[PDB]
Design a protein around this ligand. Structure first.
Ligand code: SAH
Ligand code: ZN
Ligand code: ZN
Ligand code: ZN
Length: 431
DNA sequence: TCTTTGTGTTTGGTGTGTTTGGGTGGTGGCCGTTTTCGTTGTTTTTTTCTGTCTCGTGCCTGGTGTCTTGGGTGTTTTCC
């Protein structure tokens, strides 16, 4: 496996055993209202005489304070000293190591198998106010740092892990994380712990959801590798009307922040229903009402290819194919060929005219609207097609819809045109 | 295929209804003392109005999980 980088990671910052405070007023529980009647659990101390360990307030015990995310304090609770609900104070962190893989920096891995709901590691840092946070953020942006190191302890109170903190700062974002951050009360103070969402084995990376507020900062692309990745690091939108479809997909359709604003502003503010921000359900009316302009940028072509590889909706694919019909720039088409647009168009065909979630007349209109640019694009070799074998799909769909003779004749012309093109070499291999 | 429930009529009976005698409790008479009605005065407290800080209340957005519905079966209770 990857080489250990634990000491090298430790040397990059001032290691802390506990959270540091800018002042004694910050970080106090109940907004500084000292609960003199501290919540004392009614647990009886359970001392195992063999090991001398106080087993009270354990994981499978019925300690009320543990359920309510409050730690027992020695000398005040009936559970006695050294109970099993002093995890933050005793600093009983899980054993972890630091390593590096993929496009990520340093990352945290489990040195041992960790149970579900087990406390992993206490996020450490300096407790700071809002103005100090703004000053440090401006300084780091001037320094060009490309890493988040701020977490919101609570309203108006943040934790900075840049110069001083703990191993938890090296945990990387995952869109399907195995751990999560939670807020707990220890004495008259507030702590942020990290707990295991599931069973984690040795060697596996430990990750948590950042749910990051950008505060107007630019998006950063997410390289977590999870299948459910949204592609960028963020959280909830700063207001409604901000997105209706995912960016790459929205920009593939020619839509931008203004066009996504305009639809919601025209209907939602005038007593017509638009659901919350969720891309699992496509709103066909927005896609139909969207305006379409020809593509002349290769990054937009890459976004179109990503939308083809991602979106399953019939209407979004219809409007993307219509936009491609408007598009006539040869360089963008050559880029789409390099991106293997034929491969995506094969699946787009298959989902609509082999799988039947729609009506035959509308599918016929779709097929006539998608054969045209296939007929129009520049082609110079069958090796372009060989990366997709879309001809096979064309044969299957002309055979299925044999009653619709215009589609069959167009596919005849298309395969006749493609049959005459040249071929390119593949090195023979020993046998 | 196959068990219950009602009102009605002849005859019995036991408990409701009626009738005399008396004794005890309700009815008539007058006298005294005080409980309460009436008035008058004080003054406590209850209402009604004005101004600021405060903290909670109202509303809106996102969503986790608790509430509701369909299927099987078996074991628990029902019937003779
Ligand atoms: N899944 C991911 N893909 C890309 N960058 C990631 C990531 N998870 C974390 N990061 C990067 O790491 C930052 C958090 S700090 C994590 C430790 C740091 N990468 C280091 O090795 O020193 C994020 O702001 C981001 O820049
Ligand atoms: Zn306890
Ligand atoms: Zn305890
Ligand atoms: Zn991701």
């Amino acid at each position: 496996y990857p080489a250990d980088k634990t000491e090298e990671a430790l040397t990059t910052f001032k290691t802390l055993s506990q959270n540091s405070y800018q002042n004694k007023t910050l970080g106090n529980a109940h907004n500084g209202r000292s609960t003199a009647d501290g919540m004392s659990c009614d647990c009886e101390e359970n001392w195992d005489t063999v090991s001398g360990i106080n087993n009270a307030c354990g994981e499978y015990s019925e300690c009320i304070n543990r359920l309510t995310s409050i730690e027992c304090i020695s000398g005040t609770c009936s559970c006695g000293d050294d109970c099993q609900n002093q995890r933050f104070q005793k600093k009983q962190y899980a054993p972890i190591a630091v390593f590096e893989t993929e496009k990520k920096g340093y990352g945290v891995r489990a040195q041992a198998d960790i149970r579900q709901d087990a406390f992993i590691y206490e996020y450490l840092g300096e407790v700071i106010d809002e103005s100090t946070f703004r000053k440090r953020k401006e300084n780091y942006d001037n320094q060009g740092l490309e890493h988040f190191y701020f977490m919101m302890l609570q309203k108006g109170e943040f934790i900075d892990a840049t110069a001083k903190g703990g191993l938890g700062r090296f945990c990387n974002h995952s869109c399907r994380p195995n751990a999560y951050v939670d807020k707990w009360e220890v004495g008259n103070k507030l702590r942020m712990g990290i707990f295991a969402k599931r069973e984690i084995y040795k060697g596996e990376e430990i990750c948590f959801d950042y749910n990051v507020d950008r505060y107007g900062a630019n998006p950063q692309k997410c390289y977590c590798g999870e299948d459910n990745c949204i592609g960028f690091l963020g959280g909830r939108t700063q207001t409604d009307s901000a997105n209706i479809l995912p960016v790459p997909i929205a920009e593939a359709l020619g839509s931008t922040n203004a066009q996504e604003q305009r639809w919601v502003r025209l209907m939602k503010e005038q007593n017509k229903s638009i659901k919350a921000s969720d891309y699992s359900s496509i709103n066909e009316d927005y896609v139909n009402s969207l305006e379409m302009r020809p593509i002349a940028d290769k990054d937009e072509a890459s976004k179109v290819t990503s939308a083809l590889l991602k979106t399953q909706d019939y209407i979004i694919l219809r409007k993307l194919i219509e936009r491609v019909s408007l598009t006539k720039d040869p360089e963008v088409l050559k880029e789409i060929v390099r991106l293997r647009g034929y491969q995506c168009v094969a699946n787009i065909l298959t989902m609509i005219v082999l799988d039947q979630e729609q009506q035959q007349v509308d599918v016929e209109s779709f097929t006539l609207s998608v054969l045209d640019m296939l007929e129009s694009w520049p082609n110079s070799s069958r090796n372009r097609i060989s990366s997709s074998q879309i001809e096979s799909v064309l044969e299957s769909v002309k055979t299925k819809l044999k009653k619709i003779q215009p589609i069959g004749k167009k596919i005849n012309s298309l395969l006749n045109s493609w049959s005459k093109l040249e071929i390119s070499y593949k090195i023979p291999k020993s046998q």
